[PDB]
């Protein structure tokens, strides 16, 4: 188990254009093509993304490219990010592994925001960090894709995904 799994698991995979749970234009696993609400403001994105007419659809091997590419965003993200830096260096592997996820499904900016789990986090309170999670709009809207994610920042084991 490792962070491509554990998010395939999460995303698992649409080889065309469909609605997250947040109401946006996405496709492969997990990948944000656009926040607007046009679908061919999506459509350039993902032409854009891919390097040809798709027009809507791709292929597995593209999508493991574009998924690829996400992971590295999301590690880039959270290092670049002096609010999510100290916080990630402090974790343990493990949720390590749930940081990277939750940037990746939520983004950078949204996580920052979270003052509170973050400096619950970075003291070790993962039972409160855990509740007070459960509790963001992104759980609420997206309950099985994050589900997993937060028993994992609260336990640091990887049973959610067996
Ligand atoms: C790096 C990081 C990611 C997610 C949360 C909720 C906190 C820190
Ligand atoms: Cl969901």
């Not at 496709?27 to 607007?36: D, P, R």
């Not at 350039?44 to 891919?50: N, P, T």
């Not at 997206?142 to 028993?151: M, S």
Request: contains cysteine.
């Amino acid at each position: 188990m490792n962070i491509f799994e554990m998010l395939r698991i999460d995303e698992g995979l649409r080889l065309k254009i469909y609605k997250d749970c947040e109401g946006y234009y996405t496709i492969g696993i997990g990948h944000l093509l656009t926040k607007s609400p046009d679908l061919n403001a999506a459509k350039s994105e993902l032409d854009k993304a891919i390097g040809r007419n798709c027009n809507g659809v791709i292929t597995k091997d593209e999508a493991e490219k574009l998924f690829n590419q996400d992971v590295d965003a999301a590690v880039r993200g959270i290092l670049r990010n002096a609010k999510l830096k100290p916080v990630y260096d402090s974790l343990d592997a493990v949720r390590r592994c749930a940081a990277i996820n939750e940037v990746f499904q939520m983004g950078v900016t949204g996580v920052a925001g979270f003052t509170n789990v973050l400096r619950m986090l970075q003291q070790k309170r993962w039972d409160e960090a855990a509740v007070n999670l459960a509790k963001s709009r992104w759980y609420n809207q997206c309950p099985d894709r994050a589900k997993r994610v937060i028993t994992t920042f609260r336990t640091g084991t990887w049973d959610a995904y067996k």
